[PDB]
Design a protein around this nucleic acid. Structure first.
Ligand SMILES: Nc1ncnc2c1ncn2[C@H]1CC[C@@H](COP(=O)(O)OP(=O)(O)OP(=O)(O)O)O1
Ligand SMILES: OC[C@H]1O[C@@](CO)(O[C@H]2O[C@H](CO)[C@@H](O)[C@H](O)[C@H]2O)[C@@H](O)[C@@H]1O
Ligand SMILES: [Mg+2]
Ligand SMILES: [Mg+2]
Lengths: 412, 556
DNA sequence: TGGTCGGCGCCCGAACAGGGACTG
DNA sequence: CAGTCCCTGTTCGGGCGCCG
């Protein structure tokens, strides 16, 4: 019996129509159990084929959870609601959250079920549940409340959310809270034990307002970057200098102060690749000056709230991955490396999935956005396996690329 | 209250700001008219059809086709213009059930609903738009205009509305009978239980009463008490199943339409019959204009077609699914980018078979295609059984390890073991990670003139070896490949090659064993003969070493 | 006579996207 | 610095097969 905030799609844009993909027996069983309870509690109700909108659904286990979590792929809907949760009811981003020694992430998704949803909008939250071997047709539902994973849910609930937060915020002014979709990011500078304790306090605080919380802990200050690095060699072959010149030439699209002249002089002839080439003093100094420049930052790289974040990932082998986040080409807001992740040395897809998640998390903390990923994988390989390894409640945008690596600029 | 209401209906709006169909009827032959008029008049007594005063300004054509394997005729109303203007639905039929999915059941009943479309009420407000005019033996008698009171054959909302309505009716019975299996596909119902045969028939009739309550009638004529049941084009036996016999045309002279039926039949056959190959038969269909055009069979498509027919000679059958035992998929390489696979649980007792022949990419190798086939099998298995089979693959564990660790793309195969059934899948050549000491270094480049389509490909080497070759009707890309081909031809068994072509380096680094381009195939042929190849890239026009010199030669 | 609907599969070709190299 | 041309890969609608 709460007032329902009206919602509309972006003008000229129809609702999502996205086929449901096949699900494993364990996921289908979990979804059927989850939806049966949700229907009894009135969160969802069954619908007919007259509704022409569908959104994909599947189930995940969050990291170490062991308990299934329903997850809806609302990316298409969220793109057609986009203006709503930005222009009007959006959330500001605490630039200080990345600076806190510890940041915990809480799943407050359950709270959204309290508020109801605009009756006119519910037609767009439809999702179909598939059956093994197509024994039954698809069992369609739609949402009567604020759905988890929709981008209107945190905006409509922000009024309710702040009042619940406000006693806690007054008790601890220093602590910083950020809300991205189903997640609450709680960043304190306290010591570990005190930090964990305050999270229990905010848990109880959420409990007496009627919210269950099924703790993702971050240390954004530990986060570092991955500089472009030039090898140190006692002796240089013609091949080594040829590789170095190519890497430096590419780097000059990012750092305009890079110079290859004195290093090019070393390869004037037509020489065997394995021929050892002593460096001249002029080349040694040119190489020295270059290594210093690469320590420096790029000139005039600053985040722009209007522009989308783009993430590129490269597979370096031996369980190592490199990524760059940017908005304009060669103006990188962050560059990093991930090593020894889950599935290292046995599963590229599990590792790529873990990488996408970590990068998205950092983007949420640093900028309150999720990037669009350029994924070094084949479309059919990714779609087949990615849901098996997915442990997050959001889903970023991605595209697929096949760029063979001429030079290992980011890694060594 | 002229028309009674039986079961809950589905609201069906028109597309906004659009109006009902108007189009004149077909000049229907009187012979069809005899069949149509008798059935159509009967509908009104039931309430399926209603008369309408000219207040209904809508006309849509009508026609009839004989029910296959029956004397009866099927009454279908063309709604192509009404479909165009009718609201979109979301189809609830997400696929086709496969018999290999079915678990073994003690008692199986297959029953068919009668007049299934005509037993489901159409939306009351929407009924007006149905209107069509009946024809007479002469053109003198006008014929009555009729609006459907129930789902009509030929509409675009009929299947989804029926399937959703059918599920709602079935759902209470299923909740009361958790251990009955009902496969619901359109109006065909498959009912299986481990109940003993007498008790099972009690439930079967009890279910028939349940469907009767909503006006759904299951005639005895389509009832299937006794095996072998006919279901979704298959023959179902207590412990085995098979496809209903497939007739392959015998034509002595083949048109284009001929090959399509053949091809499409062989794809249906390949779900159980192992080793069906359509590659050469499909080669005949590429770039042809008329479906009617006659085409002669090559000696490749003929040999293919010969062994394909012989596979059909011997009867084959699949078994059912035992959730207790593992799922196993084995794949064989059939040559020319053709792969077949078998999914089974007990050795030599197949659940189903299949093939993956798709050629993806201009340049590829067997390892990529095997990975594609594995993915196609995995998704197919998840649909049918909801799990991924264990894989038996004709690729050495070290071959796969070498490929995926070195490849620049994320790639993965699920849990699998090596099976030593030849032909084994391997990498034909390996590029060196580091430059080869004591091997000649070929700096290669090529250029071509965009206007003349003339170009040169050549190399320079540290030993002083040199070549430049003129080329005709080429491109910059083609000459860069040519330069590399020249270096491979003119070099010893170990060679270092330096190119500035990103195009060529990208093709070759992915270790392709097959290519659409003959030039790449020849490059492959040479790479296989080498003992060691090191490919390296430098940026063009930077005054580097040999690259600068060879660039000048080919530019000339 | 030729003619309807939805689903799934294959194989095709055409139309479209986009990334590099080179041309002014 | 635009505008092409190569070249590749994706998508989508056509035909057929199969099921109601
Ligand atoms: N060629 C076609 N065009 C349109 N719809 C079709 C169709 N073939 C089947 N359907 C749809 C329409 C409804 C259903 C037809 O199935 P039945 O062949 O069994 O005809 P039924 O009405 O059930 O008469 P019964 O023999 O059961 O007494 O599938
Ligand atoms: O990953 C490709 C896949 O995208 C679908 C859903 O599986 O579209 C969803 O994901 C896209 C990429 O992130 C989004 O751009 C899109 O908005 C979202 O609906 C597929 O239909 C497509 O094959
Ligand atoms: Mg029937
Ligand atoms: Mg050149």
């Amino acid at each position: 019996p709460i007032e329902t905030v009206p919602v509309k799609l972006k003008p000229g844009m129809d609702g999502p129509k996205v086929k449901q993909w096949p699900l494993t027996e364990e996921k289908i069983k979990a979804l059927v159990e989850i939806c049966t309870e949700m229907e009894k509690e009135g969160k969802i109700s069954k619908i007919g084929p007259e509704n022409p909108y569908n959104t994909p659904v599947f189930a995940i286990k969050k990291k170490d959870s062991t308990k299934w979590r329903k997850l809806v792929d609302f990316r298409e809907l969220n793109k057609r609601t986009q203006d709503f949760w930005e222009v009007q009811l959006g959330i500001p981003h605490p630039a200080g959250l990345k600076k806190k020694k510890s940041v915990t992430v809480l799943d407050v998704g359950d709270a959204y079920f309290s508020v109801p949803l605009d009756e006119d909008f519910r037609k767009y939250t439809a999702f179909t549940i598939p059956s093994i071997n197509n024994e039954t047709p698809g069992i369609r539902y739609q949402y009567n409340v604020l759905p988890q994973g929709w981008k209107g849910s945190p905006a409509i609930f922000q009024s309710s959310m702040t009042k619940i937060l406000e006693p806690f915020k007054k008790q601890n002014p220093d602590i910083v809270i950020y809300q991205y979709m189903d997640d609450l990011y709680v960043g304190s500078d306290l010591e570990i034990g005190q930090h964990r304790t305050k999270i229990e306090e905010l848990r109880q605080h959420l409990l007496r307002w009627g919210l269950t919380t099924p703790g993702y802990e971050l240390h954004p200050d530990k986060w570092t970057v991955q500089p472009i690095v030039l090898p140190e060699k006692d002796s240089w072959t013609v091949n080594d200098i040829q590789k170095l010149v190519g890497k430096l030439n590419w780097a000059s699209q990012i750092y305009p102060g890079i110079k290859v002249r004195q290093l090019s002089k070393l390869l004037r002839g037509t020489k065997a690749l394995t021929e050892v080439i002593p460096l001249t003093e002029e080349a040694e100094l040119e190489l020295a000056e270059n290594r210093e420049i690469l320590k420096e930052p790029v000139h005039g790289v600053y985040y722009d709230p209007s522009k989308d974040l783009i993430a590129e990932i490269q597979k370096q082998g031996q369980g190592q991955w490199t990524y760059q986040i940017y908005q304009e080409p060669f103006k990188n807001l962050k560059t990093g490396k991930y090593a020894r992740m889950r599935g290292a040395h046995t599963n590229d897809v599990k590792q790529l999935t873990e990488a996408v998640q970590k990068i998205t998390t950092e983007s949420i903390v640093i900028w309150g956005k999720t990037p669009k990923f350029k994924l070094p994988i084949q479309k059919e390989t990714w779609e087949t396996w990615w849901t098996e390894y997915w442990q997050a409640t959001w889903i970023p945008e991605w595209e697929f690329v096949n760029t063979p690596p001429l030079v290992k600029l980011w890694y060594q | 209250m002229v028309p009674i209401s039986p079961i809950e209906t589905v609201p069906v709006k028109l597309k906004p700001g659009m109006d009902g169909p108007k189009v004149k009827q077909w000049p229907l032959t009187e012979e069809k008219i005899k069949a149509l008029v008798e059935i159509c008049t009967e509908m009104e007594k039931e309430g399926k059809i209603s008369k309408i005063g000219p207040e209904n300004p809508y006309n849509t054509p009508v026609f009839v086709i004989k029910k296959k394997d029956s004397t009866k005729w099927r009454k279908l109303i063309d709604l192509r213009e009404l479909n165009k203007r009718t609201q979109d639905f979301w189809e609830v039929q997400l696929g086709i059930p496969h018999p290999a999915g079915l678990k073994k059941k003690k008692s199986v009943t297959v029953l068919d609903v009668g007049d299934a479309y005509y037993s489901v009420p159409l939306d009351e407000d929407f009924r007006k738009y149905t209107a069509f005019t009946i024809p007479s033996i002469n053109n003198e008698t006008p014929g009555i205009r009729y609006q459907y009171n129930v789902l009509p054959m030929g509409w675009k909302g009929s299947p989804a509305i029926f399937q959703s309505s059918m599920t709602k009716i079935l759902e209470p019975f299923k909740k009361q009978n958790p251990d009955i299996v009902i496969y619901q596909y359109m109006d065909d119902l498959y009912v299986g239980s481990d109940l003993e045969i007498g008790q099972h028939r009690t439930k079967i009739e009890e279910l028939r009463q349940h469907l009767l309550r909503w006006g759904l009638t299951t005639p005895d004529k389509k009832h299937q008490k006794e095996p072998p049941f006919l279901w979704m084009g298959y023959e179902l036996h207590p412990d085995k199943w098979t496809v209903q016999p497939i007739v392959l045309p015998e034509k002595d002279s083949w048109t284009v339409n001929d090959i399509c039926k053949l091809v499409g039949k062989l794809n249906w056959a390949s779900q159980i019959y192992p080793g069906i190959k359509v590659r050469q038969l499909s080669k005949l269909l590429r770039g042809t204009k008329a479906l009617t055009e006659v085409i002669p069979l090559t000696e490749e498509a003929e040999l293919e077609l010969a062994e394909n027919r012989e596979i059909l000679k011997e009867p084959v059958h699949g078994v059912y699914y035992d959730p207790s035992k593992d799922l196993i998929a084995e794949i064989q390489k059939q040559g020319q980018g053709q792969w077949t696979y078998q999914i089974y649980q007990e050795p030599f007792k197949n659940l189903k078979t299949g093939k993956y022949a798709r050629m993806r990419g201009a340049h590829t190798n067997d390892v990529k295609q095997l990975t594609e086939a594995v993915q196609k099998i995995t998704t197919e298995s998840i649909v049918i059984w909801g799990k991924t089979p264990k894989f038996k693959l004709p690729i050495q564990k070290e071959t796969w390890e070498t490929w995926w660790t070195e490849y620049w793309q994320a790639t993965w195969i699920p849990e699998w073991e090596f099976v030593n059934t030849p032909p084994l899948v391997k990498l034909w050549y390996q590029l060196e990670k580091e430059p080869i000491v004591g091997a000649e270094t070929f700096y290669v480049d090529g250029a071509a003139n965009r206007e003349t389509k003339l170009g040169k490909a050549g190399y320079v080497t540290n030993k002083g070896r040199q070549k430049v070759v003129p080329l005709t009707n080429t491109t910059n890309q083609k000459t860069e490949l040519q330069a590399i081909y020249l270096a491979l031809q003119d070099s010893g068994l170990e060679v270092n090659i330096v190119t500035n072509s990103q195009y060529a380096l990208g093709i070759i680094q992915a270790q392709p064993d097959k290519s659409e381009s003959e030039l790449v195939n020849q490059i492959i042929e040479q790479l296989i003969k080498k003992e060691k190849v090191y490919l390296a890239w430098v940026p063009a026009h930077k005054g580097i070493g040999g690259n600068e010199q060879v660039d000048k030669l080919v530019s000339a």
